[PDB]
Amino acid sequence: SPVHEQLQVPQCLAAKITVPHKILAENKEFKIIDVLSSDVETLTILADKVSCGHFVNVSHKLQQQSAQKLLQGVSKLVYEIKHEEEVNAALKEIVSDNIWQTLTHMTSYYNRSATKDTGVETANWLKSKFEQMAVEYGRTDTSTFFVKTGWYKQPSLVTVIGKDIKAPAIVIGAHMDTLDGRMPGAGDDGSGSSSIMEAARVILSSKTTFKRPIYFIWYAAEERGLVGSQHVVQHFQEQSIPVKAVVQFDMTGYRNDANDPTMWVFTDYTDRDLSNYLAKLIDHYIHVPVDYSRCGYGCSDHASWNEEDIPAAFPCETSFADHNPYIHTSSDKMDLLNLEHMTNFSKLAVAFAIELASE
Amino acid sequence: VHEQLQVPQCLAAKITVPHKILAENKEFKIIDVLSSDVETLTILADKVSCGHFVNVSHKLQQQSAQKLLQGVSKLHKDVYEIKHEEEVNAALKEIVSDNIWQTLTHMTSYYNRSATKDTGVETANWLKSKFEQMAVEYGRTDTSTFFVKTGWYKQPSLVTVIGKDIKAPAIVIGAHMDTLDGRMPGAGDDGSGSSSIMEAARVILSSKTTFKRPIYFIWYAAEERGLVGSQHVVQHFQEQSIPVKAVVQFDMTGYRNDANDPTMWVFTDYTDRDLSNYLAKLIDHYIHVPVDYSRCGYGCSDHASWNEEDIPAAFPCETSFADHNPYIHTSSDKMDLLNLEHMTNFSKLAVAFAIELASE
Ligand SMILES: [Zn+2]
Ligand SMILES: [Zn+2]
Ligand SMILES: [Zn+2]
Ligand SMILES: [Zn+2]
């Protein structure tokens, strides 16, 4: 009565199978096995206990040749919210006015182009500000350095809190640059640069010892094609600095409708689980709506990480369809932005840092 | 100086500054251009609105460039959206919790619903009669039912359709009808889902709307044998060229880890990312409970069968994987351990998914 059936089984489950079976084909992630129908339910019970996946009945699709051919992806069974008190206390320390002041200063450069002296001055000033902040709060485990940009004279600025911690890092970024000409660059990406500077200040003023280093990075030459972030990613590979997760803040201040506080999670060139985690952090800690959008190839600095398979996510001020119409112009000015919106992005950065760096 | 840029085809087609093609493939060109022209390309890219470019100069020339190429996201494509509030909210108001509980009472009274048993067969026959009686009761005339065979397994899959003549990629809502052998009431798995989608089918059958797409309600056979029925159904649709736009799977809609916490879970493994995000929005907008995310592994449930053929498929579920019902696959998987409000919420989700997607 009992028939032969063929099952595609993940290796993690296949290794524990003890009913009689023949292996028909195999690869790194799967075996295809032949077993009796009367023993299949035994494999269900086993799968339940092992908790690394179940199996797919492939009898219909078939033998060793077919089976091998059939084989030419098994998911591991994390990002959670486990630090409410610490996050909520840190969110209470964010000072909106600090964001506004940083943005005032950044937007007063004629531009912040990676080919210009003003571009260079921007990088120097961000570096100093972070350094002064580390001294102000007595934070002793910090370090700063430039990562060069080839023929572009503006370097990327890399900063770290927990310089000696040997674990995959958590990275928070923005880009410091603009196009040439008169470019205040308030929204893109003065706003993100300023939002993450205030989040850095909050981490710097805490006395927590995290389980992972935390980087704050301001990339050079994003406008030129992600130049600075490509140099940073390469710098990390060449110094074997592992990275667990990256968030990008690029445009944190323009609201399509002042009364709608929705934050947008970008779904192209980003890590799916990390993106979902941002959606949760927004809902749990920021208490505003979340919606989804795509911004295209080469959209911002997260893409540089995503290309090297490092988990990276991108929350943004608007959808792509409704983006700030003044970006890349002399009209990209701070009065058109919303400080609450900028503050909310800063809160997100802080919550991402504290949750992920504490595990 | 010159610079090399990796450009999507859509943008590359519009470039009129001087440039040399160094390499190209189906989705991209790498071009060489003067540095003085790069900002021109930024402006162009902003206007063309199909993506920007990556500066690859650091990584390079034609050999490196071709080697570098060995894709491009679409930005003006249709998006899953919420555009049918009034119709959805009225249909949600028609869902009757009690009908769900009654269906579940009947399904759980079979000794089991194993695909190798007569009780498995009787389950499929009863579901088919129930859908058919419901279609006649409301005078819905554009419906049709059929069994899809399951090879050696005697339980067929039940495929049902509302809008049988409509020539457009369909919307599919599923659950599995089966259990293990022995005494398996299978309340949670997957009596609950089977019942939640039966009540959603009733609501669509009782409406008078003419949708722009056929709507399928499917109860798969032999899910517990490794997705056997779903595979037969997917193959049936491929061999008959019945196109499918989007699929949702309801597997376990009734157990709450904490009775007071009504969170619904979107499964991120073996599912379509955009459709999964859309479910999160449907949950938040129409159901008004929290959403959280979890993975359940290879061969989890019938959505995987669709996902393998690149048909967009999504899987909302009653708990996380870690916090899943502890009575599953046992005789204790009983109705009394379930929560009817949770089952009703899943039924609402099915109704909202059908009406939103089938109306576009
Ligand atoms: Zn930007
Ligand atoms: Zn920009
Ligand atoms: Zn199930
Ligand atoms: Zn099951």
Residue numbers in the entry:
A (entry chain A): 3 to 64, 72 to 81, 89 to 93, 97 to 378
B (entry chain B): 5 to 64, 72 to 81, 89 to 378
Direct quotes from the study:
LapA is a protease-activated, broad-spectrum aminopeptidase. LapA is annotated as a leucine aminopeptidase, and the Merops database assigns LapA as a member of the M28 family of peptidases (subfamily E). Given the enzymatic activity of LapA, which was revealed by structural analysis, we posited that LapA promotes L. pneumophila growth in A. castellanii by cleaving aminopeptides to release amino acids for uptake by the parasite. Thus, we infer that ProA cleaves and activates LapA.
To confirm the activities of LapA, we purified recombinant LapA-His6-tagged protein containing 378 amino acids of the mature lapA product (minus the 23-residue signal sequence). The structure of LapA contains two molecules in the asymmetrical unit, and all residues could be built except for the N-terminal His tags and residues within the interdomain linkers (residues 82 to 101) that connect the PA domain (residues 1 to 81) and aminopeptidase domains (residues 102 to 378). The PA domain is formed of four helices and three β-strands, and the aminopeptidase domain has nine helices and seven β-strands. Although LapA was purified as a monomer, in our structure, the PA domain of one chain was associated with the aminopeptidase domain of an adjacent chain, which formed a domain-swapped dimer. The domain-swapped monomers were essentially identical, with a root mean square deviation (RMSD) over Cα atoms of 0.083 Å (without linkers), although variations were seen within the interdomain sequence. In our structure of LapA, the PA domain covers the active site and substrate-binding pocket and thus represents the proenzyme form of LapA. The structure of LapA is similar to those of several known aminopeptidases. For example, the positions of active-site residues in LapA and LapB structures are almost identical, while there is a significant reorganization of helices between PA domains. This accommodates differences in their substrate-binding pockets, with LapB’s cavity being wider and more negatively charged, compatible with a preference for positively charged lysine and arginine. The effect of the PA domain is likely due to a transient association between the PA and peptidase domains in LapA, as we observed a monomeric and domain-swapped form in solution.
